[PDB]
Design a protein around this ligand. Sequence first.
Ligand SMILES: Cc1cc2nc3c(=O)[nH]c(=O)nc-3n(C[C@H](O)[C@H](O)[C@H](O)COP(=O)(O)OP(=O)(O)OC[C@H]3O[C@@H](n4cnc5c(N)ncnc54)[C@H](O)[C@@H]3O)c2cc1C
Ligand SMILES: Cc1cc2nc3c(=O)[nH]c(=O)nc-3n(C[C@H](O)[C@H](O)[C@H](O)COP(=O)(O)OP(=O)(O)OC[C@H]3O[C@@H](n4cnc5c(N)ncnc54)[C@H](O)[C@@H]3O)c2cc1C
Ligand SMILES: Cc1cc2nc3c(=O)[nH]c(=O)nc-3n(C[C@H](O)[C@H](O)[C@H](O)COP(=O)(O)OP(=O)(O)OC[C@H]3O[C@@H](n4cnc5c(N)ncnc54)[C@H](O)[C@@H]3O)c2cc1C
Lengths: 93, 642, 93, 636
Amino acid sequence: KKTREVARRMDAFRGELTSHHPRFHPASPAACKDIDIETAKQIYPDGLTVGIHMGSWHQPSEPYKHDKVIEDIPYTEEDDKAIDDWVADHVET
Amino acid sequence: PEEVDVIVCGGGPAGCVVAGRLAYADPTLKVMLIEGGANNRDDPWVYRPGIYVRNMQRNGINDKATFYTDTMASSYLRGRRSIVPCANILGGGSSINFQMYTRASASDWDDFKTEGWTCKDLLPLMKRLENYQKPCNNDTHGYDGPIAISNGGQIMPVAQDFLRAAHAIGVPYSDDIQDLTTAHGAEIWAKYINRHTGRRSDAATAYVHSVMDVQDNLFLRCNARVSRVLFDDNNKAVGVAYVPSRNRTHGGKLHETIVKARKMVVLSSGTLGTPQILERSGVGNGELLRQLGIKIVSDLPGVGEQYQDHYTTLSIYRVSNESITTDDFLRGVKDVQRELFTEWEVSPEKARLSSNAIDAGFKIRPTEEELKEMGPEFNELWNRYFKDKPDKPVMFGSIVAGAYADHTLLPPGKYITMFQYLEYPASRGKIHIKSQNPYVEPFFDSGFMNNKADFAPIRWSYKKTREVARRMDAFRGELTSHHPRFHPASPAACKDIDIETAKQIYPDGLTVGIHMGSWHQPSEPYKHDKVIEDIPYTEEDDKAIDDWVADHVETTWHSLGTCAMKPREQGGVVDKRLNVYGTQNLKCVDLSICPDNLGTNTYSSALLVGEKGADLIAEELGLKIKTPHAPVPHAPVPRPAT
Amino acid sequence: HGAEIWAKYINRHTGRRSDAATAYVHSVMDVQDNLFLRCNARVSRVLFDDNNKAVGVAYVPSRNRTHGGKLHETIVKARKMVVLSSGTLGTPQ
Amino acid sequence: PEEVDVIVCGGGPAGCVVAGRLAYADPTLKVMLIEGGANNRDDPWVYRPGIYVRNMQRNGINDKATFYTDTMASSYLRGRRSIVPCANILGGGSSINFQMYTRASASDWDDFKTEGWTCKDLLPLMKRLENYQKPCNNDTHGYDGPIAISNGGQIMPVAQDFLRAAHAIGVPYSDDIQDLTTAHGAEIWAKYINRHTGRRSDAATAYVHSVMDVQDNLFLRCNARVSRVLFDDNNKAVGVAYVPSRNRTHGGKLHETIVKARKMVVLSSGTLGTPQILERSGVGNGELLRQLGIKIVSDLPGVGEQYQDHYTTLSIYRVSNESITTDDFLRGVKDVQRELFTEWEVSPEKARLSSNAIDAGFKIRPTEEELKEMGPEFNELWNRYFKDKPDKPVMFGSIVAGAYADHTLLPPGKYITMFQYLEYPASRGKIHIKSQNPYVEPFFDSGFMNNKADFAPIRWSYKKTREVARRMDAFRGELTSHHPRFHPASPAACKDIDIETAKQIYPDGLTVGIHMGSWHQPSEPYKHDKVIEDIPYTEEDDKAIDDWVADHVETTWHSLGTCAMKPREQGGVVDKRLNVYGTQNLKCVDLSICPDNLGTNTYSSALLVGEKGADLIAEELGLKIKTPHAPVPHAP
Ligand SMILES: Cc1cc2nc3c(=O)[nH]c(=O)nc-3n(C[C@H](O)[C@H](O)[C@H](O)COP(=O)(O)OP(=O)(O)OC[C@H]3O[C@@H](n4cnc5c(N)ncnc54)[C@H](O)[C@@H]3O)c2cc1C
Ligand SMILES: Cc1cc2nc3c(=O)[nH]c(=O)nc-3n(C[C@H](O)[C@H](O)[C@H](O)COP(=O)(O)OP(=O)(O)OC[C@H]3O[C@@H](n4cnc5c(N)ncnc54)[C@H](O)[C@@H]3O)c2cc1C
Ligand SMILES: Cc1cc2nc3c(=O)[nH]c(=O)nc-3n(C[C@H](O)[C@H](O)[C@H](O)COP(=O)(O)OP(=O)(O)OC[C@H]3O[C@@H](n4cnc5c(N)ncnc54)[C@H](O)[C@@H]3O)c2cc1C
């Protein structure tokens, strides 16, 4: 939770890699937000696929704003459980 | 001019049929087609098939679609606001769709319970529109129609891979799954592509531009959003008011031009645009029109109700690197696009781009054995809807030779996706306007999954299409990221990419095979001699799949039923000849009129609605529809041939 | 005893291979509805009568990939004739 | 050959119609066509539509054009000398032009005030020349003529962008602005390009080369400059004397070859070429000839007077980098050029190069409201000329999907230009020879803007075309450098490229967004939701546009009126049959003869005049014209 709060406040931050993060309930305010649309289009500028909602695999981040005011991700007991399972699944030497 | 005989509002399939037929039937009949979208005439981003996928990008550039978002979060989809798109271009869907050739089963049409719309009444019209350019073992298709149907220039090796695996799990092969009779079988899947020219068979160029090339009485007005229909004091349609596409006049300020109709006004703006036109014109829910300050012409509460669709899911799988897929073309790899564009130009009749890469599939139907596992609320639907209706499929399933997903969210490598949709959903939505003003977004609601019966078949499908994936030659694992969130220790959990396959993607990569993270469980390397057994699922694995459905179920752009053809006292909007109740000289002919769903990709159905409308309008104006239609631009000079 | 420029099963005009399927079968299948093609189907054995008449045929998949490895024969019957054209190696078996 | 029946001088469209129609009416009729420039037959730099832009380069390599420069400097154009170029190739303008299909309004022809030149009288001849290969909702166009017309291989996405924008400022869409009737409307704009072959509809391949393939009576002498018309004791035209294109003889010494005409001598050397031929033959202003020591044959002072043109202005705008435009092709980016040339060779029917990329536009006409904002002197011309002539447009406006402008003076990125011209100028000019020599330049005077009424409409256009550009999706800014010098704090002052578009251009560049110098006022980045309101203009702003008009106005290559068809006592030069006054067997059939302007791109006009001249020589020689013409090479 703490390293997350550092990520969000960095200038370079463009989103959480949803695939590789805890399994939050999608409607939970603690859910991941993956790459934003303008950053996506830069990766594959000639691509036919960029910005296709279909599959709803990711909630895209908002495009970056240097003036953004930032507040902490609130977490519930259920979010805590998602992270506990995430730790169980992914903790390593 | 300012005055014509027939106005057609919206140039989708149905509206192109109607406009085209009628203009060709009588050169003296002055008819105008008004289309919100742009002209699609000789646009290489329409007529080339293989670029279809780009048409659904919400990327700032693409304006060939308008996108309707749910007004309010659905609890049924665990919070998300569903997105339904639809066409914003002449030819409507037909200019931008997947180009999958599918037909509804015979019983679907009968079940409209409307004289003139039996399978037997429509079969001749069904044939009238087709120019079937592929072998089949029956007499169900037409050979002098405007709309070319084919296997396209090149079938992808995975097509037959997919078929072998379908056979492996007891779904039988067939020549023709679109013979009106089949609910349980697998085919090579045809396309709305011309075998010879390699061009998308769009309704506009088949029925409209064809006539415009040889007569002066068809008028086209694109980039014209029909505001509303103008009415008599006796509720006869007199004409139509349209505004510019872009709300960009001096001050964002409304500028209507009016055009008048002597004989007929046809609304063909699709399932989402027609009810909107009716509502702001004065036809719809009286309470809703009162509140918006619109004078009532006809109180029809069904206008905008009983919205129906097919409900898509997209299971993605990783495949071998030697496998042929569209993934590197869709990423915009330079020399791969250069090669496929060049190939299409020099020899369209064999070009990879003369395909939609959806080269195989099936319609399927569950066993008695399988129905027991599907729960109480589907078994209610089954007994009441499917039980003694054996030509109706429950799910559709097809293979794309490449991921149909934002590749900005996919790992590198090649994929295939199992493109699935529920065929006759129980769930329902609605769509109502929120203003007179034609630029303000309507209130919207998909309705996806609000009936708990729709989960079981979509769950069933996922397991079934997985068993097919797991038994292919090309299969190298499931994309964990895009699959249900099973317990990692569950036998039903995913197995992602092979170490071997992975080392081929990035042979100088430093990170390939670093365990650190345990982000995926790797599949054991492909073995041709492998013995393969069904995944056993548990009640907990089932919940995970339902969750997956709630989170990733989507439209199939097969919207219908917002202007249902049934009695007024039942909530109908049109009589058996598509006249709008309460009015004169106004017809709705598009998919909005369907009182019930069809087990098909619905371009076929829309054209059929189109033709049946053309008929109905012709016998009211005492006109004879010419066969064959005007010759289609670029087509070769045309009974079955090679 | 003699030497020539050696000809090929290739159409001079189209550049294409003169394969037998396209020349005899696909030609017909394109113009008529009476020729049925079942590919990816391996014939097990010719079903026989009590009078040792050929009545039909049992075919299986090409890939051996069912659930328990269990053989899935489908049967297609014959009013008039069974012909065996599975080649020097295929026919005898 | 030393002697023929007809001699047509200059292989412009009119000349090509005349030479081809006559030779094909009567295979006995020995007709020779003499052309100052080179033969255009099967030249890939003539028949490929997409390379047209190169033909106006002053780079000491291109020679498909002669350039006339005003002898003196014009006060009215703030001291510059106007450059009017014209064609120097077989096919003339038809081999090198923008290939824009436009037709004049009905009243334009009626207003010639001549029997046989009514709209009515010419409409059948209009249909004779056209092969119309696009849809329309009228019966105004021909379908079996030599000259193929179409929307080309591929319309550019900015076409319907421009229309959507035009609509939003109250110019209505129409299926056909070339219906002789429309003066205020906007269409997809057609081109002199064959739909099926992707080749340019040049007059020479259609009318002349078609014939020369199938008969032996049509003779072609290219690279040959007609000096003078040889005359009889009774002012009958007996022949013609020509010299080589280049003056590369031993000792620069003159070399005339002579060729005699039994029946007729036709002049089709153009508005600029024709009068010169008359004057050094001894047909022109009596005094001017006296001083140059040329024996007078017929005193016609109006030879070379009443030079009319259409007055072009070019408004450049910047657009997005995802826009599709001609700019990289025009710059010479080899693999852009290689991709387009190759695409044209494999499939011309849908190639980007089977086009002129001037894919939409409008003819426009001012409201009552707008008239007030214009001058006293234009309101005067409005009453005298346009008020009871409602089928005449005041200005033409079109979109080029690219920058028609020296790219050596353009920043990087993509452009579109608003190509605008004045349909009927009040302003007038003249051309006269300076010598008996045909190699010397004549005295020239564009006459652009010497009439103050001509400013207001052009100023009006700039404003109007700007409002269109600003309402487009592709729009990312005005090119400050090539726009009027507005006061920087004026609400009308330019806004240039926005930062997001600029970064896209040079994403590894160290200099993008350095404010230092304050050389431009950046636009704010593109919003699809942006509400838009007209630029207001003050009197100072209007002065800045007037001056910008004076500084940057050009010919549109639609030159006419220097051998005019009216009564001789009104300074006319020709009969109602196009016979030169005071001569026998001599006709001008080209655009020189026009007594007044035409609200059109004048290729259509020159062809029609040609078709009409062919009729007039056909009945005078008791010939009958054949329909259809000789099949045109490479056509289906
Ligand atoms: C992305 C996509 C994929 C699909 N996949 C397939 C497939 O694989 N196979 C298949 O057979 N079919 C497919 N279809 C389905 C098929 O194309 C549609 O069902 C069909 O287009 C329905 O025809 P329609 O006339 O009823 O509506 P539409 O095709 O949607 O046409 C309606 C037209 O009305 C215009 N319009 C709407 N409102 C207004 C207004 N107020 N004023 C003016 N104009 C208006 C729109 O611009 C549009 O052109 C798909 C469609 C899409 C968009
Ligand atoms: C690599 C190669 C090179 C050759 N070179 C030449 C050459 O240069 N020139 C030349 O003229 N000829 C050449 N031939 C020889 C010629 O092709 C064959 O001898 C000829 O094709 C034999 O035809 P066939 O009807 O006996 O059977 P085959 O050609 O062997 O075909 C029999 C078919 O039966 C199928 N089959 C087998 N078992 C079963 C079963 N249980 N159920 C269902 N189907 C089955 C097989 O898949 C096969 O498609 C070559 C052949 C090969 C393979
Ligand atoms: C760059 C350009 C752009 C244009 N844009 C358009 C457009 O967008 N749309 C459109 O419809 N029209 C356009 N035109 C205008 C149109 O082409 C001309 O108005 C038309 O070609 C004039 O025809 P003409 O027969 O009167 O003379 P010209 O076309 O000028 O031909 C005259 C010919 O006579 C020859 N000649 C001159 N002097 C002599 C001599 N002494 N001896 C022998 N031969 C001589 C020349 O070499 C030339 O070939 C344009 C022209 C040019 C050059």
